[PDB]
From a paper:
[name] was unable to hydrolyse GGlycerol and GGlycolate, despite their considerable similarity to GG. The structures of the [name] variant in complex with both compounds and that of the D182A variant in complex with GGlycolate were determined and help in understanding this behaviour. The most significant differences from the complexes with GG/MG are observed at subsite +1. In the [name]–GGlycerol complex the glycerol moiety of the ligand is stabilized by a direct polar contact with Trp40 and by water-mediated contacts with Tyr88, Gln115, Trp177, Asp182 and Tyr222. In particular, interactions with Tyr36, a key residue for active-site closure and organization, are always absent, while different subsets of interactions are observed for GGlycerol and GGlycolate. Any deviation from these strict interaction patterns will result in a decreased affinity for and highly reduced activity towards the compound, as observed for GGlycerol and GGlycolate. The structures of catalytically inactive variants of [name] in complex with these substrate analogues were determined, revealing the important contribution of the reducing end of the substrate to active-site closure and the ensuing enzymatic processing.
Numbering used by the authors:
A (entry chain A), B (entry chain A): 2 to 205, 211 to 446
C (entry chain B), D (entry chain B): 2 to 202, 211 to 446
Write the structure that this text describes.
Amino acid sequence: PHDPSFTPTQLAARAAYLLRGNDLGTMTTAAPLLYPHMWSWDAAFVAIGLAPLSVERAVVELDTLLSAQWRNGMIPHIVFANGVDGYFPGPARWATATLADNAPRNRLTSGITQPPVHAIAVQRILEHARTRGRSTRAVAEAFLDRRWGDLMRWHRWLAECRDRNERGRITLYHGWESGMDNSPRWDSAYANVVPGKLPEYQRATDPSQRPSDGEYDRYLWLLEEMKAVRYDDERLPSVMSFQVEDVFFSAIFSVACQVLAEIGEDYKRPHADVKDLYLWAERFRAGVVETTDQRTGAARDFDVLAEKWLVTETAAQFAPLLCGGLPHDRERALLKLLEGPRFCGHPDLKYGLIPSTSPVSRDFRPREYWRGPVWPVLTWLFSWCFARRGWAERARLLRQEGLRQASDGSFAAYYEPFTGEPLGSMQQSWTAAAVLDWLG
Amino acid sequence: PHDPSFTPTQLAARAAYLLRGNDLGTMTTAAPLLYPHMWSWDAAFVAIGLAPLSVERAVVELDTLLSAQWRNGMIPHIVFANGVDGYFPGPARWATATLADNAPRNRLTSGITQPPVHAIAVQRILEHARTRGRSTRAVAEAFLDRRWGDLMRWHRWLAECRDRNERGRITLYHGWESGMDNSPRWDSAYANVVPGKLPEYQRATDPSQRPSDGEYDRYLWLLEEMKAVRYDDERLPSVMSFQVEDVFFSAIFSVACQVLAEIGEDYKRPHADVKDLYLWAERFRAGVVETTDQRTGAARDFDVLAEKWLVTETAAQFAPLLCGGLPHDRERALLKLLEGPRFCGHPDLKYGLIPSTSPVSRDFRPREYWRGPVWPVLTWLFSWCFARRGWAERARLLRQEGLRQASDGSFAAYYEPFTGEPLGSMQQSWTAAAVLDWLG
Amino acid sequence: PHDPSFTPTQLAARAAYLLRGNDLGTMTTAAPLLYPHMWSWDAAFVAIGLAPLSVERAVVELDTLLSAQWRNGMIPHIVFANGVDGYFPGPARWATATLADNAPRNRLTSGITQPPVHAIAVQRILEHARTRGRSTRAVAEAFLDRRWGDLMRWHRWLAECRDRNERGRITLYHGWESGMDNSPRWDSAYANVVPGKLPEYTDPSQRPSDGEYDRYLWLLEEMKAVRYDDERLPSVMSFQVEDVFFSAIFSVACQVLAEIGEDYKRPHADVKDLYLWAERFRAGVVETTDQRTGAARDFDVLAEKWLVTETAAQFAPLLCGGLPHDRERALLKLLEGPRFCGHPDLKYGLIPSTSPVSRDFRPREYWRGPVWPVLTWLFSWCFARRGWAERARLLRQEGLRQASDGSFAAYYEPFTGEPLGSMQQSWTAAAVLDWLG
Amino acid sequence: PHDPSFTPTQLAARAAYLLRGNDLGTMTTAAPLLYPHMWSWDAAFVAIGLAPLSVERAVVELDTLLSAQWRNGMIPHIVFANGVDGYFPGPARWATATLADNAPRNRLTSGITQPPVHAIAVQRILEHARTRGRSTRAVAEAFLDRRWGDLMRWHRWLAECRDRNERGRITLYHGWESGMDNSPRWDSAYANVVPGKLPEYTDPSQRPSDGEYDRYLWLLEEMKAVRYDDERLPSVMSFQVEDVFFSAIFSVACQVLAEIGEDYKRPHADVKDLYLWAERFRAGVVETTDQRTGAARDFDVLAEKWLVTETAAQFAPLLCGGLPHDRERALLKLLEGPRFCGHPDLKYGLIPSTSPVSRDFRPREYWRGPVWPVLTWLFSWCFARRGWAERARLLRQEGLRQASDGSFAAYYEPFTGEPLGSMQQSWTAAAVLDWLG
Ligand SMILES: OCC(CO)O[C@H]1O[C@H](CO)[C@@H](O)[C@H](O)[C@H]1O
Ligand SMILES: OCC(CO)O[C@H]1O[C@H](CO)[C@@H](O)[C@H](O)[C@H]1O
Ligand SMILES: OCC(CO)O[C@H]1O[C@H](CO)[C@@H](O)[C@H](O)[C@H]1O
Ligand SMILES: OCC(CO)O[C@H]1O[C@H](CO)[C@@H](O)[C@H](O)[C@H]1O
C-alpha cells in the first residue's frame, strides 16, 4: 500500500532468491522467460552476485562459460542450455556446431562475442574469498590455476583478432556484440546493411520495446554473412556489412586488462602474461582517448567501412571515465557533461542515474531498450569503475540511487527514466546481482 | 579471518539462497542430506521464511502439505518426495500406503503427526500479503477459501482423536510426534517400551549426535505396534506401549486455535468454526495450566500408561508462557525460572537463549539434539509467542540473541550452548526461515 | 536534491544531536524557540529518547521534573527554566509561587497537570539499563529508591483528587491538561466558558484562535481566585471534563508501575493500590464506550453530557484494554478503516489527530487533524504491550518513514506530509531514537 | 551482559550526542577532561563529524580555528578556550600573546603547528552540502568565499617557511607538531635535546615519560627566546626533523584544495600553486623511500641522517601516491603482512601505530603501538581516493567493529582491543559518524 519498497534485508533476500531460481544447475539463465540461456556478460555479473552467497557456485558460473570458449579464445555471447527452445536465433540458426571450425565440442553457442567484463567478476570473487576462510581462498585459487590460461586466450583473441591494426580499439561485426543491441550508436552503420535472400524465420510483449522487424532482419542478415565464411576470423573483414570500433567495449577491455594484470601479479602468474596485459591496458586506453571530442572529452565510435566517426549522445561517450587517460581539463569537461542537464542532471529524471541515451537527443525514446532507459547494469559498471578511479563520493551516489530504483524488487533489466516504471523483462539475473553486490 | 559473521543483508541473502536451493518444486526439504523430504512442522516454518520472498510460493508449501492430509484430518509428520531414498524409515517401512485406511491417495507419508504450528504460518503469510498489493492479498485469500476446511479438520482431529477424554492435552503415541525425539521428557516412557521381534533394518556422522541403537530400536518398534492395528485411531489406546500427554504440543495447539480463530473472524469464516476454535483454545490452555508446579509454574508432561506426572528440566516446562493462563504470581515465578541460572541466565552460555535441557539437569548433554543444545526454531517460537503475550522487550532480546547466533551463516538446526559451535545438520531450512522472519 | 530523506544512522545521529542541543543542563526544552521550558509529558518522552544515549542523563531529566512536584503530589505541566520570558503565560501570570500553598520551593511551575506517561519512561529506562550491565543498573535502581515514593504520590493525587467520586476517570480543569489543547473534544465545554474582565496580555493555520485564548486565560483566573486549592476547584471552575484518553494512559501507567514495583520489591501496599487504580480506570474508560463501535467518549461534568467527537481519543480503550472481545474488534475496524488510518488521501498509514471525514477536521490546525509522532509512538508502544506485534510494527515503520526528513516536527500535514508547527521538537527526536533502536 | 556492542543506529546516536556535549559554543573540545580546548587537526576531524549533523555548525568549527590563524599563515595546534587551566602547558607557559609578533588578537593559542588535514574536512563539508540542497550549498560556498584566502595562506606558510630549501618535506621544530608525540620516530632526535634550567612546573603505561617532558618543555623555551620568529628558528632549535607523514598529508591536502579551487572557480594562480606543492611534496615523500620495500623515512636535519623506524608513518607514500609500481606493491605487502595488519595476535585488521615486532613496540603507550581510530580513518579515506575501494572498506569495517563498544577512545590496545587513554574523544566520534553514513 503506502510504501511498496523493500527494506535492504528483504531486497537482498529477494535478489538471492531470484538468482537461485534462475540456476539451471551449472549455468544461470539471463532471465527465466525472455533469455533462458547463459549470456556472456550477464554471466560475469551473475558470478559477481553469487560471490557473497557461495564462492564455489560463483566459480562454477565462470567455469561453465569458459568451457564454451572457442578454440581461438573467443567467448561467445550465448551458451545455450541443453534443452530449451524459447529463444530465437537458436543453435540451429547459428549453425556454429556444423560450420565453425573453432566452436567448442560439447556446448552449443552463438557465433559472436560480448564485452570482457569477466576479469572484473574474477576480482570480486577473489575479494569475497579472501574475507572467508582458507578453504574458500583455496577454491578461488584453484579456479585461477585452472582458468588463468583461458582468461589470457580470451584477452589475446580480442587484442589480436579484433584489433588487427593495433589501433587500440575493438572491432565489432554485429551490434549484439556491443551489448547495446539497438543503441543509436549503430543506426548509421545498420543503414548500410542490406539483407539479401533471408531464410524464413518466426519471431523473437509490449511493442514500445518490441524489436522492430526491419531492425531484426538486419541483425539476422549479419548472421548469414558470418555463416557464409564459416565464422573464419580472417575472412570477416572482407565480407561483413557491419564493422565498427566500439569505444565503450574498448574502455571496458582496457580496465579488464589492468584488473587481470593485477590479479596475475598477486597470484604469481607468468610474468609474460602480466606484461602483455599491462601493454593491452595502455594500448586500449590510448585508443579510447584518441576518439574523444576535443572540447567535451566525449568518446566516439568509428565506422570502419564508412571511415567516419560516429557522433551520438549515449552513455557510451563516457567510456574514457572508465579507463582513464584524458588530460585533466578534458576529463573535467566530460564529468560536467555526465552530471549536467543532458544526462544525470536532467530535470525530469526520477533518479540521479545515467540514461542510456540523453533525454535531449533526438534519438531518445524513454521506453526503447538502449535508446533512453536506465539500466542497473550500467549503473553498476560506472559505479565500480568510478570507485576504482578514486571517485568515492561519485561512486557512492550512483550506488545509492541504483538501490533506491531497485528497491521495488522488480529486478527489471531497465527502467523508464522519468517515471521509474520497471520495463521489459522482469527477473533479470544481472539486476539481482548488482543489488546483491551493492548491498554488501 | 578476524570476523566470520555476515552482515544482516548478506545473512538474509544467504538464508533465502538456501531456502530456494532446498526447493524440490512444490515442497522444500527439511535439510538437503539428512532430511530430504517435507517434515510437517518444518514446512510451517518454511512457509514463514518464504512469505517475505513470495506469498505465492509460501502458499504452495502449505498446499502441498495439506494435500497429504489424512482422511481423518491428521497431518502426517513426513511427506516423502516422489524420488528419494536417503532417509529411513521410508515409505516401505511405514507401509501406510497399504495399511492405513485414512492415508492420502496420491502422496506417500508417515503414520504419525507433529506440532500444529501451521496456523501461525498462515498468520505470517496473511500479514505479509496485506503489506503487498491487491493481487498478493487475493492469493492469500484464495488459499484460505481453498484450505480453511482442511485446517479445521486438522484442529478437529487433534481435539477429538488425541484428546478423547476432553482433558485439554494432546496424547502422543510416539516421541517423534513431540518434535523433540530424544528429549529427557520421554526417557521413563521409553523405558517401558519393550521391542518384540523387530524386522531387520539398516541405519539412520558424529556419534555424540548419533541416534543410539537401543533408542532407535524402540522408535521403530512403536511403528510395528501401529502397523499391527493398521493405524486405526480407535485401536491405538489399546495396543500402544507409549502414550504421553505432551504439554508443549498442547500449549502450541492452544495458541494455534486462538490464532486460527482470529483469522476466521477477520476473513468471515463460518461462525461455528470460530466458536469451536475459541473453545479448544481455552480447553487446552486450562489443560496446560492443570499440569503446572504449584511453586514455579513449570508444566509437566503426563505418562498415560503409568498415570504419572513426568518431571524433567527441559524447555517444555515453559509451555504456559506460550498459551497463557497461569495466575499472575505463578507466571512471574515461571519467568524467573526461564531467566535464571538454570536456563537463559546460566553463566556459561554463549548467548542469552533457551537451552533445550537445563545445563544443571543431570540429563543435560551439550551436543545431543534435544538434551541440551539451543535450537533456533525454539528461539523463534518463544520470541513470537512472547511478543503475542505483549512482552515486547523479552521477545526482542530473544530475536537479537538468535540473530547473533545465526550470523555465522551455518543455518544449523541446533548449537552447542556453551561454545556456540553449530551442530548436526547444516543447511536446515527452518533455521534459514527463522532468520528471514527475524530480519524483516 | 533527488532524495532529502536521511538514512537510519544519519537520522539517529541528528535526533541525538537535537536532544543534546536542547539540553539546558538538568532539563531539556520541549522545543528551543517556541517552548523553551520543561513540559511534563514532553519530559517523559525526552527521558525515553535519552535512555539509549545515557541512562544517567535520562534519570536526571525525571529527577528534575519530580523536584518540581507539588506538595500534594501533582506534577505541573510546565517547569520554567531560570528565565526566558518568550513563553506566555509565564510565572508572573500563573502566580503559583505566591498563591499556591502546594507549589514547590525554588522551582517556578504552572498550576495545572498533564498526562501521566512518566511510568512508561521509567520502564524504558529500566529496560535499557538492564542491557547495559552492572553500574548502569545501579544508576537506574538508585533512581527508583529515590523516586518510588514520589511516583506513588503522583499516581495517588490523580486517583484521589482528580477522581473524587471513584468513577475511574480523571477530571480536568483546563484543556491544556489533556495535552490536546485545541482538540474538537473540548469545543462544547469551551463554548460554555464565558470570561470576565481579563488582565492585560507565525502561521495562523497552525495556532488556536485569539478568542480561544481568552477562554484559556480566564480559566487560570478562576484557579488563582481559589489559590489552586483542590477542594475548592469543583465549586468554581467553568470547565470540568472527564478525559477518557488521560484516564486510559493512567490505567496503563498504573499497571506498568505496579509491575516495576513487583520486580524491584517495592512495598506490597503500593503495588496493590497501583493494581486497583489500573483496574478502576480501565473500567471507567470502558464505561464511556459506544456499545456498537467501542469508541470512547469524554464527559462534560458541568453539562452532564457525553462528548461525542471523532478524534484519536476515541481509541483510548485500545491502550488500556478491558473492552469485550466483539467491541474491541469493532473499535479496531474503526481505527483501520476509512475514517482514520485507512482514509485514501493519507500520505502515511498513521493515526490523524481528528478524523478527516469529521466536520471538525482542519488539516493544518494542531490537534484538529495533523499527525503527531508522539501519538504514533504512544499507540505503537501500547499496541505492542497488548500483543499486537504487527500493528505496532506498522505504526513504527510509517512513523520512521514520516520522520525521515529530519525536521523533527511536532505534527505533520496528514495528506501531504508537510512538517508543520514547531520544528526541532524534543519528543519527536525521542520517538525516533526509541523506534530506531 | 552478553553483548556490550551497540547497533549502528545506537552508535551513530551516541557519537553525535558526544560531539554536541563537547561543544563549547563555537569550538569543540578534543576531549572533555584531558584536552578541554580546540586542537588543530582534531578540529578538522570534528568538522568532518559535524558535517552530517549540521553543515552550518561544521563550518563554524573551521571558522573558529581559522580566526586563530597567525599573521604569517600558521595554524597553531591549540586554540585555548576562555580559561580552563587544567591543561598544561597553557597560555602562560607558551607566552605567545606577549612574545609572538604573528600571534592572533583576541585568541590565546600555542606557538607550534599540526598536520594540515583541514582541506580534507572542507571537501567532506562540500560533499555533504551538495546532497542537502540549495540553502545548505550556499552556506558551504559562503565559507569558501570567506576562507579560501586563509586556507591558501596556511598552505603557503607550510610550503615556504617549513620547506625553506624546496625539498618537498615539512620541517618540524617539535614532536608535538607531528601529532604523534611519543612515536619512536622521534626518539633519536629527542635524545640529542639536552635541556637547561627549566622554569618550575592516571595510568603511566599510556603517558610519555617525565624525562621526555622536560625535553618537550625545553624546546618551547628555545622558541620563546627567539620570539617564535620563523627566520631565527633554524639557528636555535635543538630539534629539527623532516616529517614524511606530515609531508604526505600536505601533498594530499594541496591536491584536494586545488580540485576544490577548480570546482568553485578560485583564482587560477592559487590552483596552480596548489598543484605545484602537491607534486613537490609527493616527490619529497618518494625521495625518502627504501628502494626495496617502499617504506618512507623521516630525516633528522641536525644529525643529517635518515630516521629508520617501524611505525605507521612508513606508509606515508600510500596516502599521496607517486611511488613506482613495483615499490608500491612492496609497501602494500609490508602493510598487509605480519609486521602490521597481518600480525597474528591483532584483534582487528587495523594499522597499529608501531609494528608489534619492533623493539620499540609498547602495546599500551600512546603512539608506540596502540591502534588509533583517527589513523584508521585517514588511511581508509586516502585509500579510497587512490581507488583501493576494497582496502578502504576493510579498514572502515574493522574500525566500526572496534568502535562499537561506544567508548570513543583515542586509541585501543592492539591485541585485546581494550579502549585506552582518554575516553569521549571527539575525533573518534567524528570518524564513526563519517564511516556510518
Ligand atoms: O536479443 C536480446 C539480447 C541479444 O544478445 O540482448 C539483451 O539481453 C542480453 C541478456 O540479458 C544482454 O546481454 C544484452 O545486453 C541485452 O541487449
Ligand atoms: O529423525 C529426525 C526427525 C524425526 O522426525 O526429527 C528431527 O528432524 C526433523 C526435520 O528437521 C524435525 O521436524 C524434528 O523436530 C527433529 O527432531
Ligand atoms: O500551547 C502549546 C502548549 C501549551 O501547553 O502545548 C503544546 O506544546 C506542548 C510542548 O510540546 C505539548 O506538551 C502539548 O501537548 C502541545 O499541545
Ligand atoms: O600530549 C597530548 C596532546 C598534545 O598535543 O596530543 C595528543 O592529544 C591531542 C588531542 O587529541 C591530539 O591532537 C594528538 O595527536 C595526541 O597526540
